[PDB]
Curated annotation (Swiss-Prot), chains A, B:
Pathway: Xenobiotic degradation; toluene degradation. Disruption phenotype: Cells lacking this gene show a complete loss of toluene-4-monooxygenase activity. GO terms for biological process: toluene catabolic process. The alkene monooxygenase multicomponent enzyme system is composed of an electron transfer component and a monooxygenase component interacting with the effector protein TmoD. The electron transfer component is composed of a ferredoxin reductase (TmoF) and a ferredoxin (TmoC), and the monooxygenase component is formed by a heterohexamer (dimer of heterotrimers) of two alpha subunits (TmoA), two beta subunits (TmoE) and two gamma subunits (TmoB). It comes from the Bacteria. Transmembrane segments: none annotated. This is Toluene-4-monooxygenase system, effector component.
UniProtKB/Swiss-Prot annotation, chains C, D:
The keyword Translocase does not apply. This is Toluene-4-monooxygenase system, hydroxylase component subunit alpha. It is an enzyme of class 1 (oxidoreductase). Fe cation 2 binds at residues 133, 196, 230, 233. Disruption phenotype: Cells lacking this gene show a complete loss of toluene-4-monooxygenase activity. It comes from Ectopseudomonas mendocina (Pseudomonas mendocina).
Swiss-Prot record, chains E, F:
One of its GO terms (molecular function) is toluene 4-monooxygenase activity. This is Toluene-4-monooxygenase system, hydroxylase component subunit gamma. Optimum pH is 6.8. Pathway: Xenobiotic degradation; toluene degradation. The alkene monooxygenase multicomponent enzyme system is composed of an electron transfer component and a monooxygenase component interacting with the effector protein TmoD. The electron transfer component is composed of a ferredoxin reductase (TmoF) and a ferredoxin (TmoC), and the monooxygenase component is formed by a heterohexamer (dimer of heterotrimers) of two alpha subunits (TmoA), two beta subunits (TmoE) and two gamma subunits (TmoB). Belongs to the TmoB/XamoB family. It catalyses: toluene + NADH + O2 + H(+) = 4-methylphenol + NAD(+) + H2O. The gene is tmoB. The keyword NAD applies. CDD domains: Ubl_TmoB. It comes from the Bacteria.
Curated annotation (Swiss-Prot), chains G, H:
One of its GO terms (biological process) is toluene catabolic process. Inhibited by Zn(2+) and Cu(2+). Belongs to the TmoE/XamoE family. Component of the toluene-4-monooxygenase multicomponent enzyme system which catalyzes the O2- and NADH-dependent hydroxylation of toluene to form p-cresol. Also able to convert benzene to phenol, catechol, and 1,2,3-trihydroxybenzene by successive hydroxylations. Pathway: Xenobiotic degradation; toluene degradation. Keywords: Aromatic hydrocarbons catabolism, Monooxygenase, NAD, Oxidoreductase. Transmembrane segments: none annotated. It holds the Pfam family Phenol_Hydrox. This is Toluene-4-monooxygenase system, hydroxylase component subunit beta. Its EC number is 1.14.13.236. It catalyses: toluene + NADH + O2 + H(+) = 4-methylphenol + NAD(+) + H2O. The alkene monooxygenase multicomponent enzyme system is composed of an electron transfer component and a monooxygenase component interacting with the effector protein TmoD. The electron transfer component is composed of a ferredoxin reductase (TmoF) and a ferredoxin (TmoC), and the monooxygenase component is formed by a heterohexamer (dimer of heterotrimers) of two alpha subunits (TmoA), two beta subunits (TmoE) and two gamma subunits (TmoB).
Amino acid sequence: TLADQALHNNNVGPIIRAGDLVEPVIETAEIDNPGKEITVEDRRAYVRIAAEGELILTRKTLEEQLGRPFNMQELEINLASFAGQIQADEDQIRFYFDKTM
Amino acid sequence: TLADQALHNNNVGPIIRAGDLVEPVIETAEIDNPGKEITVEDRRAYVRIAAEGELILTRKTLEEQLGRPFNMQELEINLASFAGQIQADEDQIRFYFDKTM
Amino acid sequence: AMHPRKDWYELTRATNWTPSYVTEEQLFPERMSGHMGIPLEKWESYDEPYKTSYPEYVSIQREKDAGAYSVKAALERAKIYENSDPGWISTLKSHYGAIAVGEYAAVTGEGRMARFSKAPGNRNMATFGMMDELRHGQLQLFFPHEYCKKDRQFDWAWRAYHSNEWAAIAAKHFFDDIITGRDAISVAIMLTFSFETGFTNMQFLGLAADAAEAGDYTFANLISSIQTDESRHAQQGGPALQLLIENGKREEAQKKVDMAIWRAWRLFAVLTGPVMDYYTPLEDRSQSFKEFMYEWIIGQFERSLIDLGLDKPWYWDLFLKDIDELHHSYHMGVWYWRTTAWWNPAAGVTPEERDWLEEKYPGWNKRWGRCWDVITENVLNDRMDLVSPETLPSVCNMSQIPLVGVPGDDWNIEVFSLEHNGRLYHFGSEVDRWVFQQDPVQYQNHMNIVDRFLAGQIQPMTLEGALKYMGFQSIEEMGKDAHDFAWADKC
Amino acid sequence: AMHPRKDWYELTRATNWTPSYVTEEQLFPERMSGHMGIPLEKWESYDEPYKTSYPEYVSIQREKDAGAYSVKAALERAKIYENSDPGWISTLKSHYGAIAVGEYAAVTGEGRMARFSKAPGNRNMATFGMMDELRHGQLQLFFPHEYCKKDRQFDWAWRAYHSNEWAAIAAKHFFDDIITGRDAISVAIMLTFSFETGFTNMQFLGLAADAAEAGDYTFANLISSIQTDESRHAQQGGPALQLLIENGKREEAQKKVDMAIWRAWRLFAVLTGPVMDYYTPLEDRSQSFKEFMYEWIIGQFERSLIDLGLDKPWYWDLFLKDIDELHHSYHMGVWYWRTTAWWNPAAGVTPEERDWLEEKYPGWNKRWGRCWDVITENVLNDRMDLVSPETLPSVCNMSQIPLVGVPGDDWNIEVFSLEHNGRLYHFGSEVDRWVFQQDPVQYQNHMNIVDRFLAGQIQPMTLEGALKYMGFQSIEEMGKDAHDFAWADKC
Amino acid sequence: AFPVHAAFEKDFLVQLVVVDLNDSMDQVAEKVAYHCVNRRVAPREGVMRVRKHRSTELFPRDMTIAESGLNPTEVIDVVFEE
Amino acid sequence: AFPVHAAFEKDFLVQLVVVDLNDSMDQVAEKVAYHCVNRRVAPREGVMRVRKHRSTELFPRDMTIAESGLNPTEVIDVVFEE
Amino acid sequence: SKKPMRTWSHLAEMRKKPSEYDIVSRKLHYSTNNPDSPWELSPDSPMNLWYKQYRNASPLKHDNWDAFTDPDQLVYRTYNLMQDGQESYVQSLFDQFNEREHDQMVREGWEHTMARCYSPLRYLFHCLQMSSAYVQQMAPASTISNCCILQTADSLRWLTHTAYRTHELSLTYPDAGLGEHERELWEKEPGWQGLRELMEKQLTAFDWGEAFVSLNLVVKPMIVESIFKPLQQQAWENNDTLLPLLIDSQLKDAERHSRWSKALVKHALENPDNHAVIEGWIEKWRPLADRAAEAYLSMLSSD
Amino acid sequence: SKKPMRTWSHLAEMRKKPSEYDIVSRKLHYSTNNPDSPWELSPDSPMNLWYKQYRNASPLKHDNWDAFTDPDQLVYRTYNLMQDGQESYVQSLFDQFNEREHDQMVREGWEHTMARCYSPLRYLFHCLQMSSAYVQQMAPASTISNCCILQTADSLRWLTHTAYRTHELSLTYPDAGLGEHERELWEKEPGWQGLRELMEKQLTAFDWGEAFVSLNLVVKPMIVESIFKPLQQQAWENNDTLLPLLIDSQLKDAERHSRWSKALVKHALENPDNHAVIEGWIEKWRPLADRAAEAYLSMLSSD
Ligand SMILES: [Fe+3]
Ligand SMILES: [Fe+3]
Ligand SMILES: [Fe+3]
Ligand SMILES: [Fe+3]
């Protein structure tokens, strides 16, 4: 029951450590996945950010929400974990599942 | 009285902001001015370190007390103030007074 | 102009070649490589999904450390040590002791892959992996070093892995099994996939939440920074697993994952479970240990496992039940035998805590609470001899932890035993016995500390001789009640 | 190999030349340069004792900011804003408001020297000076910006200097006098020597101590980092003073130092004095304001002044007496007129504080305490109309602050007035009147806010019309009792 | 309208008080007291008097501001008879 | 010297207890209780019995460990008669 | 009656999230609020008269100077990150070329060309430093002044390059007057006299608009095209492979100064009257600039 | 009975204040505490047998390996500070030389020499990376393993240089087999066969002592003297001015690897028996190394 329900989820997305990337990434996730609901759980040291099936962060939108020049690879200074498989390049990172549970 | 006594001092030396330079600088001041008494006042955000008339910090001794490669010019990341005139070079900084009060 | 990474990345991993002057098997021997007979050419399709490259790496890792050290420097005078609840300080002591030199051991699992993996992209990511674990080993010696001058049990950040202390031996049995003791592909599967994407989040992020609530940002900042490297080098495991599955090796892959998850589980239950539900002050418990398990292991990690094409492990229902029960008994064991630990366990059973425990674990008071009732009375009536043990707990032959069960109103305890090769072994679960049987040559002549005690290797053969054996050199180093029993005044 | 700085440093400041196509005086006009007729060749012996160079500068300043921002980022969730005493939050509000855009103004004092000083070493150090004040202006807009969304009075970090609010006008009268309004050598003497080696230590280090005690490390870390730049560019002033003295200008040098010290003093007494002795929670008062004055101004700065060959200023005994008395009356003024401030003054007169004040300032209760007794009773008996003013305080024509004195059992108050050029001016000390008389063209047609009120420029000519005049746009922006009077429950 | 600046006995500052051309010093004194007594200064018995700031002579109580020759924005003290 | 591992009824673990070759199950039971009752387990009335771990048959009370055929380091349960 | 905002009131009424640059750079000169007194002093104090005359009364006019934007959007923090990477690169070049004994291998006599034509550049660059600081302190918007501040620092950077290399070169060639004779050359050598006459006059153009146009639209483009690039060509012909790399780093800065300059001109030309003001100052200064270039080039390629 | 110490118990009994390097680097292999089982497992598990045979039974012996000290005393933090400055310098060189179209100006045919002799270096450097990681995991002291870790990272650095430049060069010369034919050359070209035979054999020397001597005292010095330096000379003759600067940066790393290597040998020779062990391994490998050098050089300077 408890275990079952917790397992049948398709939540994907970044876990961001406390710091200056938390709000920009939340705002980026909202902007770049229009008509997904973004969920956010705040555990003070980190924030768990998720969407169903797929969540995209583009460099361009994250730089705009952050307010300063930003390269996609730098996200790892603050990406402490993530749910989903990850596909990452110079332009965006995508968290996604192959399967639907 | 109060003002007078506070004014007739020949105390010279660095005021170090809170951080990883506080103890190495105290220990350096002791080592590099043998037979001066080093005085230390701890105000939590900063530490006032002094000797009479002259206080020398050598790069070599400060690197040894700090435990890692150190260049004299870097001391300004943590030198928040100082008493005395200052004479600084690649090898040491000297805090000193021309006059004796 | 500079050319973007996607245009030259493939050349960085075009490094496989057909050997001629030695054979392929001489160059990649199976006992170190673990390639299971899969030819070289099949490994070339390995594609690490979390890439980096050398110029980016040194630049971004430089910036990660600048922040970690700057924050530590700016907070040295915030009197965490002196003002923190002693249960929090013990959390710091067990963490640094159980982990610092285990990080440095992980360099060798990554070096194993860097040399012996037939996947070129793995060999390069393992090379950043080596660098990362070096970072983590050095951070977590440097950060506690400060504290040696306050408290000799902070010496155990360095000393633990050189000791025969029982929890150090459980740490080393586990890391030597899944990190330093097996071939490259076993490391990829057991360490980078099973341990590093599943369980370490509990200790480096779950516990960071608690540290943040406790006002200890040096530590929360540090361990969450560390986990950002993990997030990258742990992604070496999925593509190896995918390759094994595509080349006919799903069953062998599954068995390695099953084993590593369970080995990791019994170790986190004795280290992190007590920290989260007892040592961490009540008001800093962001979530219960079980809630964090359901978030990090059931909700995030088991779902990732499913997505890569593997099955839930066969013992999944044993596991769920264990999350409800096991660490409560390990905490009791660690606390009753506190004198054998290098930290100071907090009892964590004031009435207000017991209410929380009862909320987080309905039925707790009629179970573990029955034992704590006996303990708490002894303390009130100043019968301190009933609060210290005069014998050894029976220790597991797999995970090296005591054999435990549910106490109180529905007492249930089971030992799973095995005769093998003229010897009698005891395991604390069905799964532990099964792990042993997957690879007896790995374990069969290992002797746990109780084995050693009964065979004559611990002199004198007394609880005190065992204390000295475990490396303790003064009464101050051995563990004590964290609050020196002041919790009983609240009872 | 690289050559060490001492071998090429002299060439970096070998930049004076003899002009031919314009005259020296056209190139360095006295009204912008302030060279007092001293020829070009004499300035070449100027030797900045705290050197830096461009490669070192960008490298080390990069590392200073990395730490400042990293610490701020790691602590954003420590709930300082929500958990701090409201007196501490008001300290942050007055600090950022009174200072951020004044830092950016200091860029222009440094640019004044960078272009118009005849000393080449000064022109280069002024160029790093420009860079430093830019840093400080940007830090102290960036750091409070976070907080706009919590509290509109944090908008005043940016807005204050664009307002006619009376304390903003006192800030601007002072900085425009000693930073942006005078020739290069006056800047060197009044700003870098008198202000920057003497008084700013009170606000960027004295107050950092208090911030550290308050558990606000973001802020303590920030402002102490800032002061490390100050320590370097402030050393432009001593060698100019030494040069003036060697070329026959000691008297003019002395008069500039005397003036700048006193102008700075009356401004710190209204900003820092209340912060240190009233707004900062009692338990975070590292030292009293007067103790910090004796450490930073009498003990450190006056002794440095003596060492360079100058005299104590003529008003030194007025000054000592003022340290005992003045800020207690400025605090009372700011708090009774709190609705004209953009922060929320704390009264700071609980019995426990009054005991501290009495210890730090024997006789306080029979003086200011007499007024606070009347105020405190009104509050207990809920007579809130007696706790808000219905008129304007009489404002100074030099420092733009109200005219005050010692109240209570030995009431003493004096106004020093002056008729000049068909107008009547009022000064709050002998020294303020003397400053005016040193340079009347600088001040004579300036109109303080009460002048403006009485001449018709404030409509309506009511306390409310003056509140709107000062830039306040909602009741929430105007200052209130920090604890909304809950301190009276302790009385 | 006659702006003076006034310092009330045992108070901590000088304040702008707008009195009238034809006020007696007695009324001037009430108007300044308004902004002082029971706000920062404790009431007391006695006859409130007006004098030019720091001076040793009181204005007569009946005297008017205009009778007095005071100029606008000059400073006055309000004090109690010895 | 005869090392067994023993699990006491309502206790939370298994402990090493060194009993004697010639002990009755009654004495074995006392020796294990020593490390259990009043430490983590509340005293109670009734007859303490010894059985091989998880088994359904009690050893007779008079029986000795050597009479019993138990091997060293085997697991026993100490429990109260139904 | 109102409520907290997410940013400064002046940035509040725009759609986009304020950037770092916006937050810390915009509308910071309060000295432009009161036309009758720039500074909070007597309305005719000397510095108030100075600003009223040389800023407020410039014929170069715009009703929203503060709306100017650095096309690079640099702040102190990002200038130093950038320049620490470029300067750390130039210092590594210095160190490696020194290790390789680069200087001994230049063509016969090149040290004399350096001593005449290169090392006295420290005077010229210092003049650009002084002049940039003047535009900083006079400009009518903080976003404009901020570009000048950085430009002032870049000019010191170039000056410092030149000082280091003058000294270093003298260590291989100690008899060419390197580090000894530059002031004389600046004052008396015919090839330096056009430049010096240009800079002395430019440094006494006190109108903020004329200072900016003459410095950034006439003087500095002339230095790129008539001093930097021909010195690179001359080094190529004399087997000086360090100098072209150094000047390429300096040209990076120069091209940045030119970018913000053109952006300011674009901002200025929103006012149609401003096009004849800018052009007349360009015509006014261009002949001094051209003479300065020709005299230098004749020196450079002379015997 | 005792009391808190200022440092780890193992560092406590020395006069000097422990450095960063000491605190974070020393005596971290617990796998050397129990000679009969390195690893906390069955004493004859496979990896325990492996270590007993290839570490513990090495004839290269010392009773205090842990006392070894990196003469550079590098830790992770200071390696990255250093290498970020050197690598940021090499990337700026890449960017500026590309801006200048350096590659088009090399001498006719030089692209073919690069495609044959330079770009297949990625195989060689990767072999050095693999081999360094092996010495890391076998070495009997953490201070030794730490030097190997950094050496492994430097080898990847060189590999990555080579990959970037192979790709970049192919953009100017798309018909030379650059980025297409390196594996074939490595496997089949006669000039690559000595090296490849050397590395394949070296990578199966599993004794930790022999691995270290053959890699760091024979193979890597041969690459400096027979591959790096002659490639710099060849680039000089073909108007490739980038490659000599790049290789100078790589040589910096190589000279660091050589420094810690000699320091380890100095530590080893405190045991007089160790001098015949080291020398015999040097004699054993030197002929494969010399053959490898000669075959490469013949390729390099052939037609
Ligand atoms: Fe790790
Ligand atoms: Fe890891
Ligand atoms: Fe400043
Ligand atoms: Fe300053």
